[PDB]
Point group: C3
Chain length 276, copies 3
């Protein structure tokens, strides 16, 4: 015992941490479990990104406010899933508001051996008016959509219509491609727009329009504009042509009339001076 | 004496080492958690909102919201250099056929292409596309496009020869259409290739075909056509009786002119005297 | 008294020093720098680098990020900008290996509106830009494919709408515009076709049907026969079959043979008439 164990007690009261002024390990676990671990976890509220002088890059490998690199991992980078019956908005939205914006909303830069982007609308229980992909532009200065391919032996755009039913005449009103040409919806007075415009700006040796059925040629328009039709055909009007110079060329009115006039002349000549 | 009270107050009121983290242990535990200023996540981050005030708003909504208004750079980049893998990079999925919104909505103002998909040149050509579209919904068009072009096509397709040699692409086309029966047990099809219409009515050509920018064939708004070269029908062609020199003559026209000449000649024959 | 120096040494041993632990307030400061699972604002780059981390391809539960909206209103993800200009696209998907055997994006959609919907809004000034641009340099495959099963519609539906009230303003426009070009770098030409229509199975339908105000104007039928609904022209000869009906076009052979028959009959009547 002394008078100075009271010094040692005061050193402990001074130098050791009070319970009320620090978190216990259990309180710490509680508070840490409310935070996202780098190894994964479940976010139940809104996660907002608001980068601001944050070194975010445009790079298509290392950029982005979010960047997901799957180079060393199996699996998808990102999945958005819903089994909801109905809801108040789309799964994914990309939006840009300034008409000076000089980049795309979405850029896909794809190397690989399957389809870069693949959009599937599954069979509904009841048919309805909806599409896999809808495109709309209100920009008059540009094509709403552009496609450019380098196919050796295929179409740049390939469209297949497939009968949804087993019965051969169920799809008789359907088409692979349907084109409409309309006046302005709000107060338009008409339109002069064309349906299909085909050109070859460099010049092609190929057929401009080729039609087949069961793989057999039925109708074509050649590079010179001449056509070949494979069956009986009709013009509800006159057909202007060149005068024929071969047996199966269509005859003109001039050709008929000239032939008639030649025969006439020869016969009238024989009539005016036959003797018995 | 009464210092055993003071000792018991310290044993009661002071924190035990075993029951609290050191500063060093705290750093370790904090470094495992994501800083608001950024970090690297190495596991799955799952979003499971549930009565969480998530909105549909195309500016402030989303379980994730990225606003790039005040920042340079991309909002999001998904990248892979992997040789092969077990699934697509991004997937959107909706399971109920009553679902009444889109999987993806792009709302774009700007002066370049809103969405831009590029398939790069492979080492070896293969059957794969930039964009593949499939619908099993018979009540709707698989794809729809609407544009308001002053002087362009709503859809522009260009085919470009992949090779220097002029004939290499002789089996290619800009647009290729096929019309097929149902794959599982179908008995045939009556579907059409191309259906063009103007529901309001157009003064324009329905089909206009050029080569090197010079008109070669067209179909006009009335259905009449102009062909720019020798042509063939493997069959009969029905026309109207000609009323001008270069109109094609009908069988009736030929026969009536033959009959008129006949009549005139037989009349002169039956009635001349010597 | 005397031996409580053991009890003091047990306190010096067992109790935490102030200097070696964070106060509650220091802890709050450090925790407030970290993201709460209930939400918050990230201001730097969030990087995902999974590496033997059990990430799956599943279109319901996979992904380094997975968003399930089954139990919640709202969008899964929103990317927005009101910026004037910037240095790159909002969203980017990129794959580098030409052996890569999956898609960049897969949309598996059931529902009753459009799966993917791309809208280019009206700009202040017309310009050359599109809602959707597609480009392939793969010669072995079609740049784009579409398959549909429509009962009574087109698989691809294209509408051109006049941007202006005046009827002739859009006279150079088209619903579909096709070009056929040689290779840009040193190409010697092309033999590619414009439009190729086929039915591999065989169709009873018209191959090409053109209407104006819903009335048939021109068509090509399943057999290749055409019907044109107005005055028409060939700048050249037209080969046809010899006519066997009144309105069939007459051939040169038909004209010549009928001329020769009449000739024969007349010369015969001439060499044998008597008065
Ligand atoms: C159908 C038809 O006939 N239409 C006619 C028009 O023709 C069309 O023109 C368009 C057009 O050019 O506007 C053509 O589309 C282009 O097609 C190209 C493929 O051949 C696409 O690459 C191009 O898209 C651009 O590609 C850039 C690229 O090279 O990758 C992208 O830029 C990169 O962006 C990323 C992300 O921001 C950056 O990371 C990257 O950078 C580099 O990053 C890195 C790194 O490691 O991350 C390293 C480097 O050091 C960095 O520099 C960018 N790269 C560069 C080079 O800057 C662009 O974002 C992307 O847009 C397509 N162009 C567009 C605008 O879409 C189409 O093929 C034609 O058909 C014709 O123009 C018109 C008038 O004549 O008439 C029409 O009828
Ligand atoms: C090719 C052809 O001829 N087809 C024929 C059919 O024509 C096609 O019709 C479709 C159609 O109408 O179904 C046309 O597609 C529409 O095109 C419009 C452009 O002209 C698009 O805007 C429209 O897309 C819809 O756009 C909505 C919009 O109002 O902009 C979106 O709604 C917004 O969604 C966001 C995100 O969920 C919400 O935030 C927002 O809300 C507001 O939010 C905010 C905010 O700051 O966030 C502020 C406001 O206070 C809130 O109210 C929504 N907006 C509002 C106000 O509701 C939709 O999500 C999006 O769908 C296109 N519509 C569709 C369904 O795709 C196409 O142009 C035509 O070609 C024709 O229908 C048919 C005739 O029988 O025949 C076909 O052959
Ligand atoms: C237009 C035309 O005539 N073109 C023809 C070609 O025709 C086309 O063939 C395509 C083809 O490649 O087969 C057809 O596309 C396929 O369409 C179906 C819908 O009918 C679509 O489902 C295919 O996408 C694939 O879908 C599967 C799926 O089963 O859902 C996806 O796999 C799944 O992935 C998720 C996520 O990773 C997993 O969770 C899930 O477990 C997994 N499921 C399974 C079973 O593994 C897969 O990712 C996806 O590819 C789609 N196929 C492709 C490759 O896109 C197209 O409809 C059709 O028109 C024709 O093939 C050729 C023949 O020479 O000629 C062309 O002219
Ligand atoms: C109304 C009419 O019949 N006009 C007659 C006129 O025919 C028209 O010719 C013009 C033309 O060649 O100038 C055609 O305009 C072309 O239309 C296509 C499709 O809409 C469009 O792609 C062309 O734009 C050019 O093409 C592209 C491209 O990306 O496709 C790039 C060029 O830079 C771009 O400008 C467009 N051409 C122009 C210059 O606008 C129109 O379709 C025809 O109807 C005919 O030539 C003359 C002489 O007989 O008479 C008129 O009455
Ligand atoms: C088999 C055959 O030759 N039928 C003859 C028939 O021609 C058919 O006419 C119908 C019709 O106009 O009623 C055509 O059907 C139309 O086909 C297109 C292309 O698939 C489709 O877009 C039409 O859908 C309508 O489209 C629109 C719209 O504005 O886009 C509005 C409507 O809601 C939508 O349904 C579709 N029309 C309908 C109602 O089915 C068909 O393609 C032609 O083959 C001809 O009219 C009659 C009389 O001479 O004879 C038949 O033999
Ligand atoms: Ni006589």
């Amino acid at each position: 015992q002394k008078e100075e164990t009271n010094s040692k007690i005061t050193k402990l009261e001074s130098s050791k941490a009070d319970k009320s002024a620090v978190y216990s390990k259990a309180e710490s676990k509680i508070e840490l479990d409310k935070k996202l671990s780098l190894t994964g976890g479940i976010v139940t509220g809104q996660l907002q990104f608001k980068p601001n002088k944050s070194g975010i890059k445009p790079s298509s490998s290392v950029g982005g406010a979010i960047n997901i690199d799957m180079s060393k991992s199996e699996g998808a980078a990102m999945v958005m899933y819903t089994n909801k019956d109905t809801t108040d908005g789309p799964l994914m939205i990309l939006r840009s508001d300034k008409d000076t914006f000089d980049q795309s909303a979405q850029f896909v830069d794809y190397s690989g051996k399957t389809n870069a982007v693949n959009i599937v609308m599954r069979q509904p229980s009841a048919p309805n008016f909806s599409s896999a992909l809808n495109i709309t532009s209100a920009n008059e200065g540009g094509s709403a959509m552009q496609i450019r391919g380098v196919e050796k032996a295929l179409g740049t755009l390939k469209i297949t219509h497939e009968n949804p039913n087993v019965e051969a005449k169920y799809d008789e009103n359907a088409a692979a491609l349907s084109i409409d040409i309309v006046k302005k919806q709000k107060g338009g007075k008409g339109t002069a727009a064309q349906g299909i415009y085909i050109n070859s700006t460099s010049g092609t040796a190929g057929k401009m329009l080729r039609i087949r059925n069961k793989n057999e040629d039925k109708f074509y328009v050649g590079p010179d504009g001449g056509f070949h039709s494979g069956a009986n055909s009709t013009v509800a009007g006159n057909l202007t042509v060149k005068d024929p110079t071969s047996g199966k060329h269509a005859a003109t009115k001039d050709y008929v009339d000239e032939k008639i006039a030649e025969l006439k002349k020869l016969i009238l000549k024989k009539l005016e001076h036959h003797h018995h």
